[PDB]
Design goal:
21 strands; 5-stranded mixed β-sheet; mainly beta; 460 residues; binds 1-(2-azaspiro[5.6]dodecan-2-yl)ethan-1-one; 35% strand
Amino acid sequence: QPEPDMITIFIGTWNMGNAPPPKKITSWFLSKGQGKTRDDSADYIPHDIYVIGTQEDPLSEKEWLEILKHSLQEITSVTFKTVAIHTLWNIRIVVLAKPEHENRISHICTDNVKTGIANTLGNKGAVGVSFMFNGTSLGFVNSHLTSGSEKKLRRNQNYMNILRFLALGDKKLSPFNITHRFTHLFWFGDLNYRVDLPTWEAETIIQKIKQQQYADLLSHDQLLTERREQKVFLHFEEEEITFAPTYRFERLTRDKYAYTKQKATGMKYNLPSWCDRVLWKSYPLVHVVCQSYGSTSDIMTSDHSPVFATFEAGVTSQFVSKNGPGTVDSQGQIEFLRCYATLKTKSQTKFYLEFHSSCLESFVKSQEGENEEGSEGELVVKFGETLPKLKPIISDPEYLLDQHILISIKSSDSDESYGEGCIALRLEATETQLPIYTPLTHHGELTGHFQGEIKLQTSQ
Ligand SMILES: CC(=O)N1CCCC2(CCCCCC2)C1
């Protein structure tokens, strides 16, 4: 039975509006409704992994698990195994997988983050799950961010608190937040970004939705505009939205948007918005292709419609050689030439690099770089030809070309990371000097760049 080099992943996000679901929710898991939908010819083909994020979920874990498993069994005649379930207040994540994957999945982690302070601490935040699938690390975040059209900055702050403090993946990756710990990271939920148009335009917006003319609405979507201004979700992808706004509906129909201010809304308008979203970030040059992104039309218990997204995702096998794991493979090496970090910092400390990768026995610390002044004010940290030669555990190119090197640039004075990034070993050539590049972030914000050349030696 061969190990897969691709899997498909279903991501669902649904704000249930504190109401039990209807008796049938299969359209959700089938990616049927509006938007980029799944072909009918695939209906019986199970996804490998289903990740379900709910918000305002009134069910017990037991009650929801029974609905989800019975739904998937009806669709596929497969009894899915529960990988993980984690709930913070009414925010929940469930991971289910085909039984054949049970001994491919390990290192399962769960965590939550509570956002806000005092007033604003008590119902918003995120839950997450991570695990290894053979040689590939997968992370999943379900977040319910701050509501209200005039709170986009709060949502952006909630995002930064979640990526800083959610403790998933390999704890040995200590300089790295969740935006660098996984081969594939999926972040979804009721992100609560709104269509920023005047209140007086509510009926105009509704008209546009009825005509399936989303362009003038998406150009005011706060998540798209904040992402384009690099205020949030830097280096994450989202599929094009081709489904109607998923909020705020009258319950028990989808024929009506309920947008007017009411005591129940705190006297706030809820103009039709794409609150419910799926985004992802994968390591460079790993296969990830969105195969559906849309909303259901037939699940009407909530004032939100469920959202689905499906992905093909590249995976790798748990590689064993005669040599590594448990030793190095002298036929392998990674060299770095003409490397320099450009940092936005106003500080003057010495810096060194750390290289982290599961292709190394442990992380590698460089010598200090040489600081110069850039022509436009910047700090340039020159490593020249001074970086160590990295010694991978396995030299086989079928393994090594699929790996990645995480880079942290740290202050010698404080040992705090000023920037993190990632370099793919999926090179055009081996034994050849080739350009490399990564942006550097810290707390998910741009802090600089790392560039230079790489020379990769494999056993071939
Ligand atoms: C690959 C990627 O994610 N990019 C590059 C192209 C522009 C951006 C995507 C379009 C939506 C708004 C954010 C800007 C970001």
